[PDB]
Design a protein around this ligand. Structure first.
Ligand SMILES: [Cl-]
Ligand SMILES: [Cl-]
Ligand SMILES: [Cl-]
Ligand SMILES: [Cl-]
Ligand SMILES: [Cl-]
Ligand SMILES: [Cl-]
Ligand SMILES: [Cl-]
Ligand SMILES: [Cl-]
Ligand SMILES: [Cl-]
Ligand SMILES: [Cl-]
Ligand SMILES: [Cl-]
Ligand SMILES: [Cl-]
Ligand SMILES: [Cl-]
Ligand SMILES: [Cl-]
Ligand SMILES: [Cl-]
Ligand SMILES: [Cl-]
Ligand SMILES: [Cl-]
Ligand SMILES: [Cl-]
Ligand SMILES: [Cl-]
Ligand SMILES: [Cl-]
Ligand SMILES: [Cl-]
Ligand SMILES: [K+]
Ligand SMILES: [K+]
Ligand SMILES: [K+]
Ligand SMILES: [Mg+2]
Ligand SMILES: [Mg+2]
Ligand SMILES: [Mg+2]
Ligand SMILES: [Mg+2]
Ligand SMILES: [Mg+2]
Ligand SMILES: [Mg+2]
Ligand SMILES: [Mg+2]
Lengths: 196, 123, 202, 216, 220, 199, 204, 213, 203, 196
């Protein structure tokens, strides 16, 4: 079951997600990616019910890309977050609600890095770090303990690696590998997978 | 069900059934115990001799658990009851305390069973 | 509720108790359950008060309009048919047990039952509502072919009084109406005017 | 009882100077059917104490049987001690609580009235063992319809004469007959004073139906 | 809630308490339950508060369009029909229980209107959680053709019965008196309940509350 | 509630918050959730307030009787086992209890987790209660058998603190105990508002 | 209960020529705190604020949809909305969803844009309005809030005393509620300025 | 399904002073939307030194208090002394737990003098979880009373205030204030406030009027 | 079922229909629902057939033994009391609506109702069973104080006939019994002997 | 969630069990032992509901040991399995049923090695190999594919290790270590834990 994490530093946001797709008692894929690139400087990380997660993320992704094509420039992380929220909330009481939980990470030229948390109800919160999934219960306090607002990216990846080690130790599910990416002024960078 | 008071006081403070039970012990085969420095030994007389006896079947020395054994003198049928009761109790102890019994613990249990059969109706 | 109507040569007699209950609270003790649908056509209402009031208002509208268009008084049979259509069509959303009675020049005095479910049947006399259960035997034994208007009125008042004594959901006053070519005559029996039959003491 | 069968409606009670009066109609209803129209829902317990019961009449009859036997038992001793109204009310509290606690209640709400040692006693006990005392009581629909009238009179004049209490009870019984679909216009009034317990009936209230011509 | 009305010799007296509750807590000690319908017609409301407010406002507005059109003073039957037809359509989901009273060219008229759309035309009515207490007063004491002051006494007594005997009711008694000649909207009529006074003082001086952050934004 | 305990070179650290709730209502900020069973044995309390208090008090009675009959201290194993056997009979009846039994006996420092579901297990570290997930993260990242005494105190205190911060149902003060070979000591009681200031 | 899924508390309070509105700062999901700086009070004018407790998603939707409507109103009309009119606008917005409501119960606090007269109100989730002359409260600790307000509030308080009263009412109320707190924010609204403060508060 | 419980309302409060205890309650007994009586106190004298407040389901309040009374006499007969405030509290915990699977629907607060003559308050949940407190509200309006006591008696959330001892006169003023506030908002609290003051001289009683609506 | 009994000066009249149903199948069309409990004491049974037979057989046993011991004919009030005790005590496990009627030397003709739930009340006449609902009005209008035996028999036959016409769960024949100091007289009304009242066909 | 496995060769039985004790989303112990020594040549491996599992296994254990003390010699694996089954079956319709699933492994002087399977209903089957737990779904076919009746113990531990690797690869739960023991004519032998 699905784990998302984000940590925002002074000029970047780091994000990671597990790579498992499971079904019943089996992992069916171990290189699954739960991140969706919305624009040069925006990732949407999406977990929840099957079908809803991809349908929702891809719809958001295509509309963000459409906005870019229509206007010549991109939606800010904050605008995209609010766009995402409006869609989810507008569907909440409709015949087609989407059961998805999200993180939105981005870097804006003028606002700097941003990390947004959203639940399936479409409550939106800006946070210095955040996580979703049952794994969040075991890692949020690790983040509260060691995060600082000026944390460097070398130390953020170390902190991330304490969180992921804690899941190996203490979480009942087998989540042995994680996708890791960072966003800053120069866009989206793939880091090495963190594996056990 | 049979509720007669069997063991009762007599005028000079005696419990005659208990004294008679002691007489039964006195007619049993001799048994001796000696506590060594790092060994303990039990030895016991006869039972019969009797060439046609299967010796194995009449031992008067009995394991209660791995770390505790006992000899007795007196009514052998009575002993078998006490021994089995103690064997059961050694397994409760291990069950609930996760240690073998001390020798004192099981001795105390046996003694308390014996005392009860001197103060209970029908026995 | 208890409602009743009876045909005689030249007209009809209608009656009802006056109790409206929510649970076992009496929300109206002097209810008028006999509602005029046209000059000489009434309906007796039982069941949901909201339902029977809405249905009766609607039928009154339909019948009035129909009557103007035709330029003739309406048939009692037509009034009953309009009730039936609405009570049958909406039988899943209504709790209505109706008696339609009245006079017209073509067929004289007529009584129709439209019970729950929305069937319609003409009868010499009709009873309905929760209290009607307690007067089937009475009306079966007491009814006689060829009663006068005055006899129909007494027979009605008696039946209703008996129902009212026994049914917790019926009571109050007895409202009567007689309808004939000459018109509608309404009256109320109250207190000591209600027929009285002793409790059977030892 | 899990499911009440034949039942009685409201019982009223009010204290007055020198006694207590209680009232109850004579009906046993079977659902909405007014089935048994001449039954008494009031018991003389002993000389100082009376009881009136709402709810399941078979359970009331049981209580009457038990409590009647207890007063006989006590009179056999002829020892100068008698169950006071307060004691009877205590006993009844325990018995209702106890039955409630076995998940098998006696399906009743009761009014105990008494007079002993110069004091008027009026007490309530329900099927759950809820019990208390007050200057006036009304069970069932009486709690909604009669009690507001009783308490309003008693705020203007806490101490009523016997005849004033009696007139007030009659006014309440009228209201109940107008507004409770399980009531019946045939009731009893029981009074306890120095002289003992008197039960009067069958009684009826005059009713007014003028409003039938004011559909307004 | 306790709401009630009476027809007296020359008009209508409507009455209401002023408590609104959420669960078993008092939310408003002084809410107004006697709602304007037209200058000659008012309506007490009980039940779901937003439903009573919105229902009476809508009908009042449609009646104003009606009277603007006709050039005449509206009729009580018209308000009754409009309310009951709307409530019927909604099948009881609009939880408005109303006492409608007024005086029109045909004189005084009083109706009770239930959520499911039934109505009763009667010379006295009560509604709300306090309605049996108020009805007991009316059954015991109403007479036809009372004088104004007697009718106002009877209605306030009846509301008081609900106030004191129903946990759902409280605070003040409002009345509205409607005749051919006069509209007296008496809010409050009586204030039989008052908060006791405060014996200790908790005038906590500046600095008592520790402050983490402060921003003053000056305005024009 | 959040409670934790852990064995290490210098014995066993035992810590708890002090909140009690009734639904979402905060009933108390000053509950004692570490019961002194005897001068070498502690029990911790999480779950139903009455259930924990009653059953640990009963455990204390029984351990004392045991001591009187057998003329020696009950072991941590045997005490934890007495509790497990008492509650086992009630499974399915809605008792809610999660306890750590913490002592030092002839086998050295001892720590057992025991609950109303029937679990009884020995281990190095545990956390129990609505806030346990949060305490585990912090305890786990700092735990070592070779912690110094003051470092172990700091860790226990911090773990409970961080639990009170995330978990709506944990709070008040952090109460900390230390089981040593000659008995437990009460180390400190620190209000979570004073700890926030510090951390 | 839907209304407690996120927890939270808002209140408003009247003083002489000033009003106050306050909120806790926790955004949580059942037991789990997610953030501690979640906004629940929103400007609807220079001297007019709305506070929303209830389900966080609906807090945000109502605030946003209300702003949409208000901005259109102010562009079309000459002028800044009156407090009482804002209340009505909000009532109408909430009652449109009578049969599938937003799970939020707002409080409004402000000064009339022309007269500077103080106004406070609250509404239930389907838009029933309630104006008062003292205070209003909404949220998962409403009982606690009522108990503090009833005991401390007095008439005609100056801005400093109003600030202490509303602050002590909030802090002490939320400290008896597991799912409200993690901070308190207070806005004092006066004719010539807004004063915004965060309070030293328990963080458990 | 017969329900063996009903809610009958009622608010209780106890405060410990240096040499006194207060136990206070309203006098309303309710059921549904009706008032049974306006003169039904929730305080019960147990000994000269101990008073208990009980609210919730009245059938259980009556039974439990009669059980406590009987147990106090049994204790006195076997042990030749009156039960102390603390022993009454510990005993009550066990009586409440004995119904763990069919609880007494009662909220109990004990107020009295401890063995050094000092104020003692003990508060309970329905199945007997308890502790000693300095002050405590219970019952219907407890959420309304408690925060104000936290603030004014506990001095919580206040800076630069001298934490003085609680005088009897102040504690009395507070008790009356909080019940008056509660009568404003809790529909179940009202009619009258009954106050018992336990000191070494004995137990004295004040009553004050509350709103009747 | 419809059952009835009526007091007169010197005895009682009892009556029942004869229909036993399972659902709407008639499992017995000629049921005898009037069961002798002693020489001059009968009960009329409605409700569950298994229950009322079991209860009647038990009471018969109790009353017979009591009667031998006392060496006197049993009181009607004693029979009713025994029914009541058993119907009340087991009111959760029985569906039994009973009328006890008979004669004894001390109190003469007597009718007792023991309806479901197990209350007991003496009455001048009693009706019960499912069909009774349809004759309350009739019996209330028709009852007269001081009816003779023959009048009680007619009144009973007529009431039962009316109930039987309307109640799907009643029907068949009418069984009547009269009980007095001289004894018990039983008869059956069948076919054309059952009172007849026209269906009110249209003029 | 709990895994048990047994493989019987010509003159030994090999058994393994996971070492996790879990609760809700957390592993609370990673060195748990699910094996109970009944006698010199009998292991009982027990999983299922908390409380039931230990209460049941220890009751059996104590009674087996009592038999030894009463009689001078031990119950055969077969006799012990049947004893175990009698008790479980006798409790099945009682007020105190035990929700436990078992393997019994033993070596008898005259019958050789034995492996018994039992479910909570108390159906008893002798098997050449068997497993319990959700992990069984992913390992039984591995055993069917490669087991032969003459399998040597060196190859049995290898086959065991293929099963346990399959759980690391494919199972959704985190089971990183296993207890392993063998029983033969010389009694019960602890093997190294198999760990990941
Ligand atoms: Cl052992
Ligand atoms: Cl109607
Ligand atoms: Cl019908
Ligand atoms: Cl009908
Ligand atoms: Cl009807
Ligand atoms: Cl009526
Ligand atoms: Cl009768
Ligand atoms: Cl009597
Ligand atoms: Cl109309
Ligand atoms: Cl209402
Ligand atoms: Cl503490
Ligand atoms: Cl022991
Ligand atoms: Cl273990
Ligand atoms: Cl917990
Ligand atoms: Cl640390
Ligand atoms: Cl919108
Ligand atoms: Cl037949
Ligand atoms: Cl039969
Ligand atoms: Cl019956
Ligand atoms: Cl019957
Ligand atoms: Cl039948
Ligand atoms: K009636
Ligand atoms: K109040
Ligand atoms: K038939
Ligand atoms: Mg879907
Ligand atoms: Mg409908
Ligand atoms: Mg809080
Ligand atoms: Mg917390
Ligand atoms: Mg009130
Ligand atoms: Mg049966
Ligand atoms: Mg079980």
């Amino acid at each position: 079951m699905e784990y998302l994490i984000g940590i925002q530093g002074p000029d970047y946001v780091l994000v990671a997600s597990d790579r498992v797709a499971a079904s019943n008692i089996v992992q069916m894929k171990d290189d699954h990616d739960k991140m969706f690139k919305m624009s040069e400087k925006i990732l949407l990380l999406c977990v929840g019910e099957a079908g809803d997660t991809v349908q929702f993320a891809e719809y958001i992704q295509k509309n963000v890309q459409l906005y870019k094509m229509r206007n010549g420039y991109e939606l800010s992380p904050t605008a995209a977050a609010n766009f995402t929220r409006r869609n989810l909330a507008d569907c909440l009481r409709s015949r087609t609600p989407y059961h998805v939980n999200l993180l939105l990470a981005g870097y804006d030229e003028h606002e700097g890095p941003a990390l947004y948390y959203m639940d399936y109800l479409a409550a939106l919160a800006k946070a210095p770090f955040a996580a979703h999934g049952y794994g969040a219960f075991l890692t949020l306090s690790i983040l509260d303990r060691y995060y600082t607002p000026t944390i460097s990216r070398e130390r953020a990846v170390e902190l991330l690696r304490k969180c992921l080690e804690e899941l190996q130790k203490r979480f009942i599910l087998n989540l042995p590998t994680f996708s890791v990416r960072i966003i800053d002024k120069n866009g989206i960078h793939d880091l090495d997978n963190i594996s056990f | 069900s049979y509720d007669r008071a069997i063991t009762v006081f007599s005028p000079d403070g005696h419990l005659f059934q208990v004294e008679y039970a002691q007489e039964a012990v006195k007619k049993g085969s001799t048994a001796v115990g000696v506590r060594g420095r790092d060994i303990v030994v039990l030895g016991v007389e006869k039972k019969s001799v009797a060439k046609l006896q299967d010796e194995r079947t009449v031992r008067k020395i009995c394991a209660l658990d791995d770390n505790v054994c006992m000899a007795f003198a007196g009514l052998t049928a009575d002993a078998r009851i006490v021994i089995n009761r103690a064997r059961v109790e050694c397994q409760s102890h291990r069950l609930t305390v996760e240690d073998p019994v001390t020798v004192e613990y099981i001795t105390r249990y046996i003694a308390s069973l014996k005392q009860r059969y001197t103060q209970s109706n029908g026995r | 509720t208890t409602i009743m109507a009876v045909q005689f040569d030249g007209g009809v007699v209608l009656g009802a108790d006056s109790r409206t209950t929510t649970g076992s609270y009496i929300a109206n003790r002097v209810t008028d359950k006999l509602t005029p649908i046209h000059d000489r056509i009434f309906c007796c209402r039982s069941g949901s008060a909201a339902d029977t009031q809405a249905v009766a208002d609607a039928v009154t509208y339909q019948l009035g309009f129909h009557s103007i268009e035709l330029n003739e008084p309406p048939l009692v049979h037509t009034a009953a048919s309009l009730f039936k259509e609405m009570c049958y069509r909406y039988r899943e959303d209504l709790m209505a047990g109706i008696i339609i009675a009245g006079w017209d020049p073509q067929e004289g005095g007529q009584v129709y039952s439209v019970p729950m479910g929305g069937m319609m049947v003409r009868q010499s006399f009709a009873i309905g509502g929760s209290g009607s259960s307690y007067i089937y035997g009475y009306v079966d034994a007491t009814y006689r072919e060829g009663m006068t208007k005055e006899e129909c009125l007494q027979f009605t008042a008696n039946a209703l009084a008996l129902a009212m004594e026994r049914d917790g959901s019926s009571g109050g006053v007895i409202r009567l109406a007689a309808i004939a070519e000459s018109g509608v005559e309404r009256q109320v029996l109250l207190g000591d005017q209600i027929p009285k039959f002793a409790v059977a003491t030892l | 009882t899990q499911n009440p069968m034949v039942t009685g409606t409201s019982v009223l009670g009010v204290k007055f100077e020198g006694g207590v009066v209680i009232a109850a109609d004579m009906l046993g209803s079977y659902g909405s059917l007014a089935r048994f129209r001449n039954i008494s829902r009031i018991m003389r317990v002993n000389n100082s104490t009376m009881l009136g019961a709402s709810g399941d009449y078979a359970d009331f009859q049981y209580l009457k049987q038990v409590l009647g036997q207890m007063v006989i038992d006590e009179e056999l001793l002829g020892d100068g001690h008698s169950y006071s109204p307060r004691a009877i009310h205590s006993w009844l509290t325990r018995a209702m609580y106890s039955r409630r606690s076995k998940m098998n209640p006696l399906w009743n709400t009761m009014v105990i009235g008494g007079y002993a040692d110069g004091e008027s006693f009026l007490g309530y006990v329900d099927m759950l063992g809820v019990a208390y005392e007050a200057p006036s009581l009304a069970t069932g629909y009486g709690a909604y319809l009669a009690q507001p009238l009783l308490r309003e009179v008693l705020e203007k004049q806490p101490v009523l004469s016997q005849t004033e209490a009696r007139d007030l009870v009659e006014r309440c019984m009228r209201v109940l007959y107008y507004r409770d679909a399980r009531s019946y216009n045939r009731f009893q009034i029981a009074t306890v004073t120095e002289k003992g317990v008197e039960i009067e009936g069958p009684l009826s209230t005059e009713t007014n139906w003028d409003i039938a011509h004011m559909i307004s | 809630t306790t709401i009630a009305g009476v027809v007296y010799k020359d008009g209508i007296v409507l009455g209401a308490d002023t408590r609104a509750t959420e669960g078993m807590v008092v939310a408003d000690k002084n809410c107004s339950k006697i709602h304007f319908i037209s200058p000659n017609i008012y309506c007490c409301g009980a039940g779901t508060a937003a439903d009573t407010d919105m229902t009476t406002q809508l009908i009042s507005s449609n009646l104003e369009l009606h009277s603007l059109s006709t050039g005449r003073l509206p009729r009580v039957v018209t308000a009754n029909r409009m309310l009951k037809q709307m409530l019927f359509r909604y099948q009881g989901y609009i939880g408005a229980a109303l006492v409608l009273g007024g005086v029109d060219v045909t004189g005084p008229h009083l109706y009770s209107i239930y959520p499911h759309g039934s109505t009763d035309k009667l010379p006295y009515v009560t509604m709300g959680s306090g309605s049996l207490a108020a009805m007991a007063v009316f059954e015991d004491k109403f007479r036809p053709d009372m004088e104004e002051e007697e009718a106002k006494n009877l209605v306030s007594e009846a509301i008081a019965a609900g106030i004191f005997n129903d946990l759902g009711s409280g605070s003040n008694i409002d009345l509205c008196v409607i005749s051919k000649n006069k509209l007296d909207f008496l809010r409050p009529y009586t204030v039989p309940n008052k908060k006791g006074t405060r014996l200790g003082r908790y005038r906590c001086e500046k600095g008592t509350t520790a402050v983490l952050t402060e921003k003053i934004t000056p305005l024009e | 509630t959040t409670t934790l305990a852990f064995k290490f070179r210098h014995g066993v650290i035992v810590a708890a918050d002090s909140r009690a709730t009734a639904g979402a209502y905060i009933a108390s900020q000053t509950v004692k959730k570490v019961i002194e069973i005897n001068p070498y044995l502690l029990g911790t309390m999480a779950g139903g307030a009455a259930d924990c208090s009653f059953w640990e008090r009963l455990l204390a009675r029984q351990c004392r009787i045991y001591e009187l009959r057998n003329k020696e201290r009950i072991s941590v194993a045997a005490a934890s086992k007495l509790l497990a056997n008492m509650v086992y009979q009630y499974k399915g009846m809605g008792l809610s209890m999660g306890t750590m039994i913490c002592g030092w006996d002839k086998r050295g420092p001892g720590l057992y987790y025991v609950d109303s579901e029937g679990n009884r297990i020995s281990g190095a570290t545990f956390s129990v209660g609505s806030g346990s997930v949060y305490a585990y993260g912090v305890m786990d990242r700092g735990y070592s058998y070779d912690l110094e005494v003051e470092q172990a105190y700091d860790l226990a205190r911090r773990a409970i603190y961080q639990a009170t911060y995330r978990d709506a149902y944990s709070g008040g003060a952090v109460n900390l105990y230390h089981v040593r070979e000659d008995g437990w000591i009460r180390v400190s009681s620190d209000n979570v508002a004073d700890l926030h200031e510090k951390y | 209960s839907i209304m407690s899924y996120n927890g939270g508390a808002v209140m408003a309070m009247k003083g002489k020529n000033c009003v106050a509105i306050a909120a806790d700062r926790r955004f949580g999901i059942q037991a789990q705190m997610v953030t501690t700086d979640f906004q629940k009070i929103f400007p609807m004018g220079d001297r007019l604020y709305i506070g929303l407790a209830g389900l966080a998603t609906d807090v945000q939707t109502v605030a946003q949809r209300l702003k949409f409507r208000l901005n259109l109103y102010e562009l079309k009309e000459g002028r800044q909305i009156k407090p009482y009119t804002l209340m009505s606008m909000v009532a109408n917005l909430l009652y449109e969803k009578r049969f599938g409501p937003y799970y939020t119960e707002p409080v409004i606090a402000g000064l009339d844009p022309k007269t500077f007269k103080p106004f406070i109100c609250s509404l239930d989730l389907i838009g029933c309005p309630m104006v008062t002359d003292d205070f209003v409260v909404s949220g998962t600790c409403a009982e606690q809030m009522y108990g503090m307000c009833e005991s401390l509030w007095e008439p005609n308080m100056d801005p400093d005393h109003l600030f202490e009263t509303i602050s002590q009412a909030m802090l002490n109320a939320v400290d008896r509620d597991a799912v409200s707190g993690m901070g308190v924010i207070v806005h004092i609204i006066e004719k010539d300025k807004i004063t915004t403060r965060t309070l030293k508060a328990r963080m458990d | 399904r017969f329900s063996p419980y009903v809610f009958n309302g009622g608010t209780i409060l106890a405060i410990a002073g240096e040499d006194f205890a207060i136990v206070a309650s309203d006098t309303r007994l309710s059921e549904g939307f009706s008032i049974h009586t306006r003169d039904s106190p929730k305080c019960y004298k147990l000994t000269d030194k101990t008073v208990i407040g009980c609210s919730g389901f009245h059938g259980d309040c009556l039974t439990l208090t009669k059980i406590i009374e009987a147990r106090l006499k049994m204790y006195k007969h076997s042990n030749n002394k009156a039960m102390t405030t603390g022993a009454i509290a510990a005993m009550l915990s066990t009586i409440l737990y004995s119904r763990r699977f069919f609880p007494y629907y009662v909220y109990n607060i004990i107020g009295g003098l401890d063995e050094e003559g000092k104020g003692a308050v003990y508060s309970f949940d329905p199945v007997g979880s308890y502790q000693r407190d300095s002050f405590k509200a219970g019952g219907s309006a407890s959420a309304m009373l408690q925060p104000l006591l936290d603030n004014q008696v506990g001095f919580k959330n206040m800076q630069n205030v001298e934490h003085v001892p609680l005088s009897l006169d102040r504690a009395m003023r507070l008790v009356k204030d909080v019940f008056i506030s509660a009568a404003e908002r809790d529909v179940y609290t009202g009619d009258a406030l009954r106050i018992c003051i336990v000191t070494k001289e004995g137990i004295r009683e004040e009553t004050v009027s509350l709103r009747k609506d």
